[PDB]
Amino acid sequence: MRERGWSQKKIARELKTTRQNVSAIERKAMENIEKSRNTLDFVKSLKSPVRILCRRGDTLDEIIKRLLEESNKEGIHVIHDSITLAFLIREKASHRIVHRVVKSDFEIGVTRDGEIIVDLNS
């Protein structure tokens, strides 16, 4: 195609560096992934609830650190970006994924992956 979401955006570097036998959707995907490992799958079962707010993309970089504090808090030590989360998630949830806006305040949340919640923060 062209891009794969994390095709060298920003912190993507630190992301690609992150893959402690965890999600590593990048390595796995590129690893002729198809349907064997069952990584994101095994973690998919969890279907744990999560919630994070999105801010001006101009702060996406910083928001990433703030996001982790929200996710990594209830998630596994991961240094992914909001841009990668959408892609990484899309894999574990190609249905309802999270987006990012750079102009106004936004909010995204989920309980498993099916039903999600959105808002403009208040």
Curated annotation (Swiss-Prot):
Which classification does the entry list for the species?
A: Archaea, Methanobacteriati, Methanobacteriota, Methanomada group, Methanobacteria
What family is reported? Belongs to the Tfx family.
Q: What does this protein do?
A: Transcriptional activator of the fmdECB operon.
Alphabetically, which GO biological process terms does the record hold?
DNA-templated transcription initiation
UniProt cross-references to NCBIfam families, sorted A to Z: tfx (TIGR00721)
Name listed for the protein in its UniProt record? DNA-binding protein Tfx
The cysteines joined by S-S bonds are none
Q: Which residues cross the membrane?
A: none
According to the UniProt entry, its GO molecular function terms are: DNA binding; DNA-binding transcription factor activity
Q: Which UniProt keywords apply?
A: Activator, DNA-binding, Transcription, Transcription regulation
Question: What Gene3D superfamilies is this protein classified in?
Answer: DNA-binding protein Tfx superfamily, archaea
